[PDB]
Design a binder for this molecule. Sequence first.
Ligand SMILES: [Cl-]
Lengths: 144, 143
Amino acid sequence: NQIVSHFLSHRNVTNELAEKISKDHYSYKPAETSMSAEELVKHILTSFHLFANVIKEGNASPFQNKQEETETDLNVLAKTYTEKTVAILEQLTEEQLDREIDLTKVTGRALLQLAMEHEIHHKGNLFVYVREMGHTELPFYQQR
Amino acid sequence: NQIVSHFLSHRNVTNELAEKISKDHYSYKPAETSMSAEELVKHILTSFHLFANVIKEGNASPFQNTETDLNVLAKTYTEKTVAILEQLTEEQLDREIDAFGRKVTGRALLQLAMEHEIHHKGNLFVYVREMGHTELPFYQQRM
Ligand SMILES: [Cl-]
């Protein structure tokens, strides 16, 4: 499964970086107009999961799903959302990837690439956050 | 040409961010073990071009191969990369490039080059924001 594998290649690094964020650094912002460390991390987690459900349904209906996540521990959020996203990705068929999703139009495949680049972008942000928090021994940005 | 289009979609933003770096902030480092502002941008520019040449040649030979203004470097390297990517045929993309002990298709090397750009641009957004610039582009143009 190259979709799941390629996702985890990047998401495993995101999760490892999230672990290096102490609870005092949840609020940490590089600049005044920046997302806080935890806003950044949660956005990475929820955004990919939204996209994964849009490809799964083929609809824009998962935007209507207001999912009130009660958990605040970033590491638990990271683990839970990774498991939920993998479970969706594992089942995605070539039909679901090939078909057009009509959004207020994009193929499942093209939205997946968009989801992957969004992850990669924000993990790119996250590396500088974590480096500024005192950590100097950081993973390579992608696992093999 | 979706290869060139998709490249410029991100590279145009990288260049736009590099324009916001004054010559006083060339040496700027967010942390002690970070690349400077100019080291980050130069690396983005040279790394994509290197990969582009590897796909172009089908060899690891491009590994065997003066300007300091970051805006001129960005313009020059973008033009050189585009010219290489414009010429890439489906044959070059499909073929296995053989040094490394493994092997990779030109297509796979291109994605890897694209993700390296997106990653480092991800870094560069935080650098530039920290340097006082708050009105920043969306991370990709919709081309
Ligand atoms: Cl420092």
